[PDB]
Amino acid sequence: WMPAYACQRPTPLTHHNTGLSEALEILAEAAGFEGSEGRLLTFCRAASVLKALPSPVTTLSQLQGLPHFGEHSSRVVQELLEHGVCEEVERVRRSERYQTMKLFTQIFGVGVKTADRWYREGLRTLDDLREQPQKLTQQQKAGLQHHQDLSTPVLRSDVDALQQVVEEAVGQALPGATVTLTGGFRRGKLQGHDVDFLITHPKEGQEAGLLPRVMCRLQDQGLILYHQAFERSFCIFRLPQPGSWKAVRVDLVVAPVSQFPFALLGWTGSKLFQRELRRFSRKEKGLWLNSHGLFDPEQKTFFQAASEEDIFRHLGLEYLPPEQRNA
DNA sequence: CGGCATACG
DNA sequence: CGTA
DNA sequence: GCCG
Ligand SMILES: Nc1nc2c([nH]c(=O)n2[C@H]2C[C@H](O)[C@@H](COP(=O)(O)OP(=O)(O)OP(=O)(O)O)O2)c(=O)[nH]1
Ligand SMILES: [Ca+2]
Ligand SMILES: [Ca+2]
Ligand SMILES: [Ca+2]
Ligand SMILES: [Cl-]
Ligand SMILES: [Cl-]
Ligand code: NA
């Protein structure tokens, strides 16, 4: 009854197994910090299964027959059910390796590979990094200077004012171009670590060269604290605050209107949902999906889509609104 | 055992 | 390498 | 770590 792919089931934002899913996601994160992407995926998938259940897991028996629950994830749930804590999870939580890899990977411009190298070099704190800044990229210097502001969640109540400033710049760059809020906010989240906007124009081709024009205008308005032809921009924006402002991460993405449903799907997430959707497409339907299109490699054709609904139908999946893609 | 999503900057 |  |  519980299908194996997260794109085959509704996953709401809030659910009935929060504590169990959070513990599995700690182990998933730690697996990623060690480069074990397969174990990260299994732990992420097991957590996601619990998010999709209709009521709390109260006894181990209820894991029987659920996909992605083997001996390891079942033992994690078992210990939480019996003692309220999982020793493995707590050992990870307080480990110096986990805490420092988390601290470092949270910096904009630092990935797992860089954080791991720093860890092996003996670095442990943000002040350790600030001491020899010539070792940092320009992106990493920005991420480090802005780290405190970037560590505070963006509120959905901040987003509308920001969307209006982006829309003004976009409308000057290309009258008729539109801005769509994507990411976790579109899935219903009340906060997020960054804001995501998808930009298009109803006349195919008119969006060509648009993003530099947008960025130049936003920069001239004094709103860009950091930015790098292009179609994705990963920025730090000045967001107004009472008597002041704060730095917020903002992603801007441009797509032609022909690709807009695919880009909207991809950027609306969740990350696990998109990975599972692309895996399902490829492995179950023989179709190749990304944020630009859906390719039939046998007939060498791209599927036209006018809506997200179209894409779910192409793939033979029941339609899920964004609020049920919180895998 | 092989596979694990798939892009752009 | 970083980013989504 | 788990599925097929
Ligand atoms: N972060 C991230 N997002 C990805 C990846 N691959 C992929 O398709 N995405 C898509 C799905 C994400 O939900 C969407 C937006 O990315 P995001 O990091 O802003 O995630 P979010 O809005 O869901 O989360 P948040 O800001 O509330 O923390 O981009 C990836 O590797 N990392
Ligand atoms: Ca099982
Ligand atoms: Ca976001
Ligand atoms: Ca983002
Ligand atoms: Cl592995
Ligand atoms: Cl893509
Ligand atoms: Na990072």
Which of A193, A207, A248, A201 has its CA nearest to residue A226? A248
According to the annotation, is A194 in a ligand binding site? yes
For residues A241 and A259, give the distance between their C-alpha atoms in angstroms, rounded to a whole number. Answer: 36
The two tokens of residue A18 are 């929060």
Residue A29 burial (10 A CB sphere; 0-12, 13-18, 19+): middle
For residues A51 and A32, give the distance between their C-alpha atoms in angstroms, rounded to a whole number. Answer: 21
| Angstrom distance, A64 CA to B1 C1' | 25
The two tokens of residue A165 are 């400033």
Q: How far is CA A180 from the centre of its chain?
A: 17
What is the CA angle A252-A13-A184, rounded to 5? 5
Q: Reported resolution in A? A: 1.9
Q: Report whether residue A156 contacts ligand 1, using a CB cutoff of 6 Å.
A: no
For residues A223 and A278, give the distance between their C-alpha atoms in angstroms, rounded to a whole number. Answer: 36
User: Which atom of ligand 1 lies at the shortest distance from residue A291's CA?
Assistant: 8
Contact A197, A179 (CB under 8 A): yes
Phi and psi (nearest 5°) for A253? Answer: -135, 140
Phi and psi (nearest 5°) for A302? Answer: -95, 140
For residues A106 and A19, give the distance between their C-alpha atoms in angstroms, rounded to a whole number. Answer: 22
**Cα distances (angstroms) measured from residue A273 to each of A63, A269, A316:** 21, 6, 16
For residues A8 and A291, give the distance between their C-alpha atoms in angstroms, rounded to a whole number. Answer: 19
Q: Report whether residue A196 contacts ligand 1, using a CB cutoff of 6 Å.
A: yes
Question: How far does the centroid of ligand 4 lie from the alpha carbon of residue A196, in Å?
Answer: 5
For residues A186 and A125, give the distance between their C-alpha atoms in angstroms, rounded to a whole number. Answer: 34
| A141 CB closer than 7 A to any strand B atom | no
Q: How far is CA A295 from the centre of its chain?
A: 24
Q: Report whether residue A267 contacts ligand 1, using a CB cutoff of 6 Å.
A: yes
Contact A321, A12 (CB under 8 A): no
Contact A19, A12 (CB under 8 A): no
